[PDB]
């Protein structure tokens with residue numbers, strides 16, 4: 001299963017790792033994508049996960065959007081995990097850089113509760129513009145299922161562990 005994770009709470013674990021590399025090594029049941037409402041996997045975690053699937057995630061996502069329309073901010077959808085996981089839970093955290101409401105971060109993390117165990121990034125962190133310390137606090141206070149957080153940035157990882165209440 002997952003290795004080298006630091007236990008934060010009863011159910012939240014954290015590691016300084018590239019989520020693509022974590023997914024290829026573990027091949028978890030669920031890998032969470034930091035998605036936008038259009039499932040346009042351009043940059044950040046989404047661009048990286050999609051590129052690891054040789055664009056298969058984008059092809060599948062475009063078919064999903066053609067059929068169903070866009071997701072809601074705070075919403076999610078379950079798609080194939082391709083070569084990374086059994087499934088990919090595409091979760092839309094609020095993008096602060098696009099003026100979206102940070103209050104929706106709790107709704108976004110609520111999606112994780114429908115899955116027993118997940119490999120995930122910190123929602124709304126990185127290019128989404130929210131404070132990662134706040135995202136980790138919402139995560140531990142919202143997610144009740146087992147979440148293995150992969151934090152790409154080492155300096156951020158250290159700051160998150162050292163400041164965790």
Ligand SMILES: O=C1CC(I)=CC=N1
Pocket residue numbers: 018019020044045048126152
């Ligand atoms: O290139 C990337 C970005 C991020 I954020 C996580 C993993 N790979």
